[PDB]
Design a protein around this ligand. Structure first.
Ligand code: NI
Lengths: 224, 218
């Protein structure tokens, strides 16, 4: 008995990520809350497998766009919420310029009250002591524009954008994202528009394990 | 079909798995003699020390080598599906701990019997009996209850493995098994297993001796 109606209030979030980069395996679990009426996430991620083989920032995009704030005049362009509760599949290919690639497949859906993002990630061809495996990325995340277009053919959407990762030496590591979402059930197909993102990364001062506290604001725009 | 097991047969076993995101690969080699129901295998953990105890991997490391007494040959699904082979799927629920999901192909490649497995382990406790390595290095005797699954033209199986824990308690692991051929009346397999070491092999390893015999039909 619902739809976008599942997001009128504060929703508990659970994220799990199975990761495989250059034969190094890891697992991340995140917990927190989202509030789509204001577009806010507040999450804590733990690398349960011990210290990560890649930098935390490289995982941020891949770790619930259903918590974007879609302004009242854009509600009919909100694919992510309309797929709920059965949810959607989110697939990406992430190209790190002059370095390796991530391929991800994710199921975002309601499991009871909770919104759950379960992810498989596989990364290949990363250079040793490149920015990623060498851990040369600053513990930062930049603002971006996620460009969304409809994919009528598969009853879903496509997304394109370039993530910018600050490197320690003052340079910038680019990560080209190509994104597909399709429904798991049986949705709104949007006119072209974008998401505007902002993200803070910090730590829990009493947490011994490798981890990431994340706060994020995202609003939809580009339609008048 | 059955004719492929009237003498000593070489075995190769390969397990690609990860448990709570901890990866590991295991290779096993040796022999089975299905007329007496005997397995003799050596398993190597390439990739280093295993994140889980060797005993938890036993069941999911070739039941076609069970001894099926003459009066029960009609009920041997395992052997009949050869050389084509079969697919073995399980879910193993460790009581008060995590779960394994496994998929395996058991088939003849040339003259050798091959068991190739995939394994996902989820939701294990960090200082539970598994991830904390609190299981004794041995292995109890069991009854594997087999039934017919006409719908998938194969069999199901259920049983409960008992793992001895160092403090003297018992870690139970509930097995659920499906086999499909890429059929018998109700019966069970009687198992016994000894595990040991090879003194000249450093790599985390398991040598396994095992005798299995089918019963439950007079
Ligand atoms: Ni995997």
């Amino acid at each position: 008995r619902k739809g976008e109606e599942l997001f009128t209030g504060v929703v508990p979030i659970l994220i799990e990520l199975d990761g495989h980069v250059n034969g190094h395996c890891f697992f991340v679990r995140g917990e927190g809350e989202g509030d789509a009426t204001i577009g806010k996430l507040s999450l804590k991620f733990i690398a349960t497998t011990g210290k990560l083989p890649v930098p935390w920032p490289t995982l941020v995009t891949t770790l619930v766009q259903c918590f974007s704030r879609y302004p009242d005049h854009m509600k009919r362009h909100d694919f992510f919420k309309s797929a709920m509760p059965e949810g959607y599949v989110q697939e990406r290919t992430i190209y790190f310029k002059d370095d390796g690639t991530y391929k991800t497949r994710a199921e975002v859906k309601f499991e009871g009250d909770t919104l759950v993002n379960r992810i498989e990630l596989k990364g290949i061809d990363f250079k040793e002591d490149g920015n990623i495996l060498g851990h040369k990325l600053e513990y930062n995340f930049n603002s971006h524009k996620v460009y969304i277009t409809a994919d009528k053919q598969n009853n879903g959407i496509k997304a394109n954008f370039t993530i910018r990762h600050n490197v320690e030496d003052g340079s910038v590591q680019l990560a080209d994202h190509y994104q597909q979402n399709t429904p798991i059930g049986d949705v709104d197909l949007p006119d072209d528009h974008y998401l505007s993102t902002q993200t803070i990364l910090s730590k829990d001062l009493n947490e011994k394990r490798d981890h990431m506290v994340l706060l994020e604001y995202v609003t939809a725009a580009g339609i008048t």
